[PDB]
TrEMBL record, chain A:
Protein name per Swiss-Prot or TrEMBL: Ribosomal protein L31e
PROSITE patterns: RIBOSOMAL_L31E
GO MF, one annotated term: structural constituent of ribosome
UniProt keyword list: Ribonucleoprotein, Ribosomal protein
GO BP: cytoplasmic translation
Source organism (scientific name): Giardia intestinalis (strain ATCC 50803 / WB clone C6)
InterPro entries recorded: Ribosomal_eL31 (IPR000054), Ribosomal_eL31_CS (IPR020052), Ribosomal_eL31_dom_sf (IPR023621)
Family label: Belongs to the eukaryotic ribosomal protein eL31 family.
Cellular component terms (Gene Ontology): cytosolic large ribosomal subunit
Pfam families reported in the protein's UniProt record: Ribosomal_L31e (PF01198)
UniProt keyword annotation of Ribonucleoprotein present: yes
PANTHER family documented for this protein: 60S RIBOSOMAL PROTEIN L31
UniProtKB/TrEMBL annotation, chain B:
Pfam family, one: Ribosomal_L14
Gene3D superfamilies: Ribosomal protein L14
Family: Belongs to the universal ribosomal protein uL14 family.
GO MF annotation: an example: large ribosomal subunit rRNA binding
CDD domains documented for this protein: Ribosomal_uL14
Name of the featured protein: Ribosomal protein L23
UniProtKB/TrEMBL annotation, chain C:
Protease among keywords: no
Example of a GO biological process term: translation
Alphabetized UniProt keyword annotations: Metal-binding, Ribonucleoprotein, Ribosomal protein
Residues that hold Mg(2+) according to the record: K360
Residue spans crossing the bilayer: none
Designated name of the protein: Ribosomal protein L3
Gene3D superfamilies registered for this protein in UniProt: 3.30.1430.10, Ribosomal protein L3, domain 3 (4.10.960.10), Translation factors (2.40.30.10)
TrEMBL record, chain D:
Name of this protein: Ribosomal protein L24e
Subcellular location: Nucleus
Disulfide bond positions: C6-C9, C6-C32, C6-C36, C9-C32, C9-C36, C32-C36
Top-level taxon in the UniProt lineage: Eukaryota
Family membership: Belongs to the eukaryotic ribosomal protein eL24 family.
Length: 100, 132, 378, 63
RNA sequence: GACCGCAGCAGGACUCCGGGGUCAGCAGCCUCUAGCGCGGGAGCGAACGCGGCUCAGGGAAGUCGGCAAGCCGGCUCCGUAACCUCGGGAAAAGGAGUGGCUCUGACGGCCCGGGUCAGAACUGGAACGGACGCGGGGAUCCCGACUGUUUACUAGAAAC
RNA sequence: GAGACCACCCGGCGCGGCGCUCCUGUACGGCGCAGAGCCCUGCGAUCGCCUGAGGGACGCGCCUGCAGAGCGCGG
């Protein structure tokens, strides 16, 4: 089950100090995946970390698209969030790739 | 003359306003405003059409200076709201020396003069070239 | 010693205690004088502030510099989804003071009104007026109860519910208000008038007329814990002062040994029930009419909706009342409008030359989407 | 309604919107917005700002 | 980074070697090498503080006092007053220019080097020391000629 | 819409799209006999067109996508 969702990180740091933007952004990615995944464990590929910090700790990209897979077993289902680089974030919305 | 609708007062006391008349004064220092009751700590304030007690600056002709003179502010840099909703402001703050009776001390009022100043004081209205 | 220079107190002690309003919405409290000789009229109506606008007006105020002259004023649109009566409450005048003498509820109470009864409708058991519906339905019980009101009641009130589905907000649960019935020749006529309005819609047009002045009641905009300088209006002290200049310096003398309630102290500013008064009703109309707010000079259909929608409010699909100036409260807040208790005698007559439907979101120059489309054309 | 245009922008000021400046040449300069006014007070040329009808005229996009 | 101050004490400790760019610079501002992430973290984004910005119109009317802040400033080129122990005053005051591109002259050695100084065009919302660095100025009066020195830790002075 | 914490007010929320409106001021790139000139088809600060463009939005309208109302606790 591979969810495909975009997240606007500009909307995430709204209300928080610019110096801690990228750390706040990473937390938002964990929290906003948890809402989609419905499972608590979220592990983000190092690629997701590099993208959020591409333009520094104060000017995180305005939007990031993440492909998240829910692979897990023995009740510890976890979501593995990767970074999908998109030229256009225009007509982009949840695009789950099937189930199980 | 008549009743003046409140306009934002842009020139506090200590303001120096230009002279718009050929009286021979160039700069007028606002000592006070006529009809002002005060509140503790509040400097007197004045706007277009209000009589202000002024003193002529050192640049002025000797006869005019060293005495308090009454004048009416005719131009105000601060924007003000007329009842119709018009917000109007002027390039400079200027005044014309006029006795409380309403006799101008000057033959001509140079430059634009505000409508409010012109209605309240009749002699300013005839003399002013334009009432924008 | 003495203050030396005379200065007034800062703030109205009448408006103390300055606490967040515990009452949920602005309450009518006192209602207009009955008169005892007028067509029976309801005296109040709830509204949700929709927005503010500009209205060009022609002034007929004799003796004023504005006579025979145009003016532009702040208007405040109060969205008015039509209310529905759900009950009638009668009140005996007792020595202790007005005390209720029983209320007769509607045979059928609407879901919005029922939603008000519960904190969570989905998880509740919907057990409201369950045995009441059976006791009524036939309606013989309702008439018997209404008859008890006719003899034992002197002040009659109508309970009414707003429907928030036809309003852009997410309240979903209804707001209930006891609107007084005034002016009828006698109490028996008053309750008869009430039965006709029962379980049927009431519109602002019936309650208030253009040209009348109404008193607007609502909870004010909340600023949270504020400093004395913002909350009570005091001076920011000299900027050469240690420990801060945003504080009243001395809060009392040696004696009285206690801080007096007069002295300004820092607390909650905002969310206060306040009643404004004598705001003239410029225009009552429905947004369903395309030409509802059109005037002869514009020559455009001009509905009440600004281009891009009211800001922090939405569709205003139904009827609306426009008041002169401002009413207490932020946009999206319930505001009880009540007939004036003391109207201003020398108010001019309202004739609106132009209304502004230019977008309030940003600065608008086009009053219709078609008008903005025409300008940008290609 | 009665309408005026910006002396700089050349867009119809709607009634009740805008600021009017009386210049020392006795010329009223009506300004639609604060931006209309600020460009004039920096004497920045009207014909080098594209949104202005003056530049629309120069491009010949709107004349 | 271990010394000395009761501490893993924004305290105090003497040397030696000292890259690049912008620059008059060993200045400020970013960087290569090399070091490295410091008595802890999360939230919320009240009052009030503490540092930092901006503010219409007026402008010291505020105050014991313009305290604090603001102005000014780099370079080139004009233009510089009273006064003077003739050295100074003086950067007096008071102005004008300054960017990018495209060129054109100057200046050596014997076709080979320097990159500074002039002079143009042309271009840009009416902009250029575009960060940074970096006097506000004048008129007087009293003391002490001056550079110096001074009560470690409330007087830096007209005192020595 | 309310707030230090609480409380208050409202609730199958929200996320991220799409229109509308608005902010700024005409996006990258491609094109030109633009361009002061210089020099070989090279160079060039810039300028005009595609473009009141593009980029952005915390206001509105909608779902077109994912979702969203605890047999959690207490009575």
């Amino acid at each position: 089950i591979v969810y495909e969702h975009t997240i606007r990180l500009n909307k995430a740091v709204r209300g928080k100090p610019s110096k801690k933007a990228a750390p706040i952004a990473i937390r938002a990615i964990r929290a906003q995946v948890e809402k989609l995944a419905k499972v608590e464990d979220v592990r983000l590929d190092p690629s997701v970390n590099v993208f959020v910090w591409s333009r520094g700790i104060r000017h995180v990209p305005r939007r990031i698209r993440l492909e998240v897979r829910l692979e897990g077993d023995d009740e510890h289902k976890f979501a593995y969030v990767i970074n999908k680089d998109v030229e256009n974030f225009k007509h982009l919305t949840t695009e789950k790739k099937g189930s199980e | 003359i008549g009743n003046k609708f409140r306009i934002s007062c842009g020139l506090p006391v200590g303001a120096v306003i230009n002279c718009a008349d050929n009286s021979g004064a160039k700069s007028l220092n606002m000592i006070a405003v006529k009809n002002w009751k005060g509140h503790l700590n509040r400097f007197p304030k004045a706007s277009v059409g209000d009589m202000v007690l002024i003193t002529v600056g050192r640049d002025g002709k000797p006869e005019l200076r060293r005495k308090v003179t009454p004048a009416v502010v005719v131009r105000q840099r601060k924007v003000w709201r007329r009842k119709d909703g018009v917000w109007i402001y002027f390039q400079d703050n200027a005044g014309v020396i006029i006795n409380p009776k309403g006799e101008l001390k000057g033959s001509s009022i140079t430059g634009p003069v505000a409508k409010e100043a012109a209605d309240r004081w009749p002699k300013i209205s005839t003399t002013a070239e334009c009432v924008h | 010693s003495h203050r030396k220079f005379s200065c007034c107190r800062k703030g109205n002690l009448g408006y103390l205690p300055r606490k967040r309003c515990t009452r949920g919405r602005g309450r009518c409290k006192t209602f207009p004088p009955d008169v005892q000789g007028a067509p029976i009229h309801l005296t109040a109506f709830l509204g949700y502030k929709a927005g503010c606008t500009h209205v060009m007006r022609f002034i007929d105020h004799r003796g004023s510099n504005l006579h025979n002259r145009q003016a532009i004023d702040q208007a405040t649109i109060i969205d008015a989804p039509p209310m529905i009566c759900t009950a009638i409450i009668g009140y005996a005048k007792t020595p202790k003071g007005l005390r209720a003498v029983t209320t007769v509820w509607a045979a059928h109470i609407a879901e919005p009104a029922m939603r008000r009864f519960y904190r969570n409708y989905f998880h509740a058991e919907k057990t409201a007026f369950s045995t009441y519906m059976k006791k009524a339905a036939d309606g013989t019980y309702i008439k018997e109860q209404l008859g008890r009101l006719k003899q034992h009641a002197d002040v009659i009130r109508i309970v009414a519910h707003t429907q928030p589905a036809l309003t852009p907000l997410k309240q979903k649960k209804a707001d209930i208000m006891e609107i007084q019935v005034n002016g009828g020749a006698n109490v028996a006529e008053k309750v008869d008038y009430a039965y006709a309005l029962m379980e049927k819609p009431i519109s602002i047009k019936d309650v208030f007329s253009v040209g009348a002045q109404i008193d607007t009641i609502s909870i004010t905009r909340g600023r949270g814990f504020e400093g004395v300088v913002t909350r009570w209006g005091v001076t920011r002290l000299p900027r050469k002062t240690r420990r801060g200049n945003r504080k009243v310096a001395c809060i009392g003398a040696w004696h009285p040994a206690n801080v007096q309630y007069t002295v300004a102290r820092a607390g909650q500013m905002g969310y206060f029930h306040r009643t404004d008064t004598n705001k003239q009703v410029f225009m009552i109309d429905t947004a369903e009419n395309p030409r509802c707010c059109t005037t002869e000079f514009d020559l455009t259909d001009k509905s009440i909706n600004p281009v891009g929608g009211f800001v922090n409010y939405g569709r205003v699909q139904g009827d609306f009342i426009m008041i002169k100036g401002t009413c207490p409260g932020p946009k999206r807040r319930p505001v009880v409008m009540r007939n004036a208790l003391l109207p201003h005698r020398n108010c001019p007559p309202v004739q609106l030359q132009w209304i502004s439907t230019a977008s309030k979101f940003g600065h608008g120059i086009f009053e219709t989407v078609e008008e903005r489309r025409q300008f940008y054309a290609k | 309604p009665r309408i005026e245009h910006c002396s700089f922008c050349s867009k119809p000021v709607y009634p009740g919107k805008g600021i009017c400046f009386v210049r020392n040449d006795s010329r009223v300069f009506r300004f639609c917005t604060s931006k209309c006014h600020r460009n004039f007070k920096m004497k920045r040329n009207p014909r080098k700002v594209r949104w202005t009808k003056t530049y629309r005229l120069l491009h010949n996009k709107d004349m």
